[PDB]
Amino acid sequence: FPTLISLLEVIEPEVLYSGYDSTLPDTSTRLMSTLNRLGGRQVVSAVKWAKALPGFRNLHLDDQMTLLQYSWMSLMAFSLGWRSYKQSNGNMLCFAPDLVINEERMQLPYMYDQCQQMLKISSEFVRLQVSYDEYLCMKVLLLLSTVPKDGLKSQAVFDEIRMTYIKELGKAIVKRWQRFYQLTKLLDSMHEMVGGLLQFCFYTFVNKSLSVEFPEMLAEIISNQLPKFKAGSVKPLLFHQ
């Protein structure tokens, strides 16, 4: 009887703390290793959030696993895009309150491009003047937005879970065609914006020279994900063609 929107509100994780010590010199290897460590933690937080998600637990495990594996990057980039929108109006990446990345430190090697792609997400929030509630329902739909070409085990429970959150975003729009059209195209563009961050992730993950550290959690997710993208057996759910 409390609305689904108010439940999403209370399972929303409190932002994690990085512990980045900008007392030492900034380097791109260090900063990337810190992002990934903060990332591995954010992801554990996002598993708890998914587990608390009305309906999510009703999928088979193979499905629950598939969905977090295929959307973790999308989840974290979407939240980062929000944090940057709220805390700095989309000007600077707010990775944590103790880690912001201004164009001083976009100027480090490797950083500019990947920080541009991330800011892009941020500026879409700025363009559309997204609400908090819009963001929350959209974020759930991100979790449900990439599936295997062979489909899921429990496709049935899945289709009805997506149905619920589609309605919920609908609600969120109105407690505030065209709007819904715009937001679902924003969802559609997350696959493209996120494919490129994934690609940079995979690059840093495999490149020996660069020595970027990943936590064991991520490393196993990324290691199992890299073959499936090689094969192109990963299917985006799109609202629009």
Partner: peptide, 11 residues
């Protein structure tokens, strides 16, 4: 199948 993620979901 990635073992930590797997173990976290079946707790």
């Amino acid at each position: 199948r990635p073992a930590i993620l797997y173990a976290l979901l079946s707790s």
